[PDB]
Scaffold this active site. Structure first.
Site, PDB file in Angstrom:
ATOM      1  N   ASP A   1       8.833  -0.414  73.568  1.00  0.00           N
ATOM      2  CA  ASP A   1      10.133  -0.303  72.906  1.00  0.00           C
ATOM      3  C   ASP A   1      11.307  -1.088  73.574  1.00  0.00           C
ATOM      4  O   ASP A   1      11.916  -0.619  74.539  1.00  0.00           O
ATOM      5  CB  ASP A   1      10.450   1.185  72.675  1.00  0.00           C
ATOM      6  CG  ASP A   1      11.846   1.416  72.136  1.00  0.00           C
ATOM      7  OD1 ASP A   1      12.458   0.471  71.584  1.00  0.00           O
ATOM      8  OD2 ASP A   1      12.337   2.559  72.281  1.00  0.00           O
TER       9      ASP A   1
ATOM     10  N   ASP B   1      14.400  -5.584  68.746  1.00  0.00           N
ATOM     11  CA  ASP B   1      13.990  -4.195  68.987  1.00  0.00           C
ATOM     12  C   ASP B   1      12.624  -3.835  68.413  1.00  0.00           C
ATOM     13  O   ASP B   1      12.517  -3.448  67.244  1.00  0.00           O
ATOM     14  CB  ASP B   1      15.053  -3.234  68.427  1.00  0.00           C
ATOM     15  CG  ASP B   1      14.658  -1.771  68.573  1.00  0.00           C
ATOM     16  OD1 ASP B   1      13.739  -1.476  69.376  1.00  0.00           O
ATOM     17  OD2 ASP B   1      15.266  -0.919  67.870  1.00  0.00           O
TER      18      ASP B   1
HETATM   19  N1  4RX Z   1      14.365   1.371  69.760  1.00  0.00           N
HETATM   20  C1  4RX Z   1      14.485   2.706  69.492  1.00  0.00           C
HETATM   21  N2  4RX Z   1      13.825   3.585  70.184  1.00  0.00           N
HETATM   22  C2  4RX Z   1      13.960   5.040  69.919  1.00  0.00           C
HETATM   23  C3  4RX Z   1      12.648   5.687  70.343  1.00  0.00           C
HETATM   24  C4  4RX Z   1      11.518   5.262  69.432  1.00  0.00           C
HETATM   25  C5  4RX Z   1      11.807   5.508  67.957  1.00  0.00           C
HETATM   26  N3  4RX Z   1      10.805   4.831  67.176  1.00  0.00           N
HETATM   27  C6  4RX Z   1       9.636   5.382  66.705  1.00  0.00           C
HETATM   28  O1  4RX Z   1       9.212   6.510  66.919  1.00  0.00           O
HETATM   29  C7  4RX Z   1       8.895   4.450  65.835  1.00  0.00           C
HETATM   30  C8  4RX Z   1       8.198   4.967  64.767  1.00  0.00           C
HETATM   31  C9  4RX Z   1       7.510   4.103  63.939  1.00  0.00           C
HETATM   32  C10 4RX Z   1       7.514   2.742  64.167  1.00  0.00           C
HETATM   33  C11 4RX Z   1       8.211   2.241  65.243  1.00  0.00           C
HETATM   34 CL1  4RX Z   1       8.186   0.541  65.518  1.00  0.00          CL
HETATM   35  C12 4RX Z   1       8.905   3.087  66.088  1.00  0.00           C
HETATM   36  C13 4RX Z   1      13.145   4.946  67.512  1.00  0.00           C
HETATM   37  C14 4RX Z   1      14.244   5.390  68.461  1.00  0.00           C
HETATM   38  C15 4RX Z   1      15.598   4.851  68.063  1.00  0.00           C
HETATM   39  C16 4RX Z   1      16.620   5.474  69.019  1.00  0.00           C
HETATM   40  O2  4RX Z   1      16.350   5.124  70.374  1.00  0.00           O
HETATM   41  C17 4RX Z   1      15.070   5.609  70.797  1.00  0.00           C
HETATM   42  S1  4RX Z   1      15.586   3.026  68.142  1.00  0.00           S
END
Ligand code: 4RX
Length: 389
Positions: free
Chosen positions: A36, A232
């Site tokens: 991530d 991202d």
């Molecule tokens: N970049 C970010 N990371 C965070 C943790 C991870 C989260 N994503 C998922 O569970 C996810 C689910 C399905 C596909 C994908 Cl690709 C990701 C989104 C969050 C948002 C807020 O911050 C924390 S944005």
């Protein structure tokens, strides 16, 4: 040149996230961990949950260290809550090192561990400034670089399949490569072009021009980056600021108007299906994002196909139809270049030289008539003006 032991170390897909195998604790406990670039906390499920097949057990780790501090991390579409600590951490298909690193042990969550997603934790690869609870909590990649001889650079090749994968298939398929400490030349074609990281918090970049099938969207470039633009991998869609999103959907609608779709399609909620193999790729436009170059008054562009922004999903019924959801959506927190954009490119997170590099991915989905592209240079002026303050 080549980091063979790291090629093919990723799994997953844009809809569930791409993950890497990690071990935490002594003896090693194996977990799958979301890759991530849009967060900065290494955080892993640490107590039983209906959607976790396994989790971090601290009492079984002789090297566990309790930091005796709580951490509470809510965002809009979900939240996690947990207990800070340190332990020993390896990446089995990564460099041959073990480091001591901060682990947030997750004790309670909501809409975070999705049913049968196959990962049990998240590896935030962005900078300390957005780490929770504060920037004093050193992010995993910082620990790695301080504690070993691994260069301050990583690179991502996320591979979208181009079609749906069932859960057996998602587990068996190779989903890409994270090269820790280097660039592998077999993961791309053409040249790498580099854009400056504006500020080391998120991986922040500047977009200077947008095109749909060559036609300039013609907005004031500040809109493209209002209030930030980030790369991202922890977000699925290409997300665009309300005003950019409206103008882009208008343009995509116009360009594909020989077929009309339900409003729920353009809102990313419902799927659209065609008969096996008849998806009319050609009626959908390409999208070019011009990024700021390293040289003064020079930009370059990355071009993506509908094979990237139309995300393959399994049909509501059961058919042999090829179905997709619209993977571009509205953002109130600036442009987010997510998994579906990143699947078109090899993306080089060059921390040492404060830049991100893009190249056409060797695993990007295309047809016989078009491919993704990274091209330049273009003469562009007043590019600092495109950033928001
Ligand atoms: N970049 C970010 N990371 C965070 C943790 C991870 C989260 N994503 C998922 O569970 C996810 C689910 C399905 C596909 C994908 Cl690709 C990701 C989104 C969050 C948002 C807020 O911050 C924390 S944005």
């Amino acid at each position: 040149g080549s980091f063979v032991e790291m090629v093919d170390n990723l799994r997953g897909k844009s809809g569930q996230g791409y993950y890497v195998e990690m071990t935490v604790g002594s003896p090693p406990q194996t977990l799958n961990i979301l890759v991530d670039t849009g967060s900065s906390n290494f955080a892993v499920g640490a107590a039983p949950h209906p959607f976790l097949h396994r989790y971090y057990q601290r009492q079984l780790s002789s090297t566990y260290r309790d930091l005796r501090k709580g951490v509470y991390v809510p965002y809009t579409q979900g939240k996690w809550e947990g207990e800070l600590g340190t332990d020993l951490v390896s990446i089995p298909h990564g460099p041959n090192v073990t480091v001591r690193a901060n682990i947030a042990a997750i004790t309670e969550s909501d809409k975070f561990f999705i049913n049968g997603s196959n990962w049990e934790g998240i590896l935030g690869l962005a900078y300390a400034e957005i780490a929770r609870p504060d920037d004093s909590l050193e992010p995993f990649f910082d620990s790695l670089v301080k504690q070993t001889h691994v260069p301050n650079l990583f690179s991502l090749q996320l591979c979208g399949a181009g079609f749906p994968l069932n859960q057996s298939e998602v587990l068996a398929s190779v989903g890409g490569s994270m090269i820790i400490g280097g660039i592998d030349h077999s993961l791309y074609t053409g040249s790498l072009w580099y854009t400056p990281i504006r500020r080391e918090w998120y991986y922040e970049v500047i977009i200077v021009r947008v095109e749909i099938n060559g036609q300039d969207l013609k907005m004031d470039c500040k809109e493209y980056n209002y209030d930030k633009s980030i790369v991202d991998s922890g977000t699925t869609n290409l997300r665009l600021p309300k005003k950019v999103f409206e103008a882009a959907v208008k343009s995509i609608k116009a360009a594909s108007s020989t077929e009309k779709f339900p409003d729920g399609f353009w809102l990313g909620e419902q799927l659209v299906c065609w008969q096996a193999g008849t998806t009319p790729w050609n009626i959908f436009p390409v999208i070019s994002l011009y990024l700021m170059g390293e040289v003064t008054n020079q930009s370059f562009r990355i071009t993506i196909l509908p094979q990237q922004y139309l995300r393959p999903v399994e049909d509501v019924a059961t058919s042999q139809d090829d179905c997709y959801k619209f993977a571009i959506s509205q953002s109130s927190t600036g442009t987010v270049m997510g998994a579906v954009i990143m699947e078109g490119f090899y993306v080089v997170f060059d921390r040492a030289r404060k830049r991100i590099g893009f190249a056409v991915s060797a695993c990007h989905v295309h047809d016989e008539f078009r491919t993704a592209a990274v091209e330049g240079p273009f003469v562009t002026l007043d590019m600092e003006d495109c950033g928001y303050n």
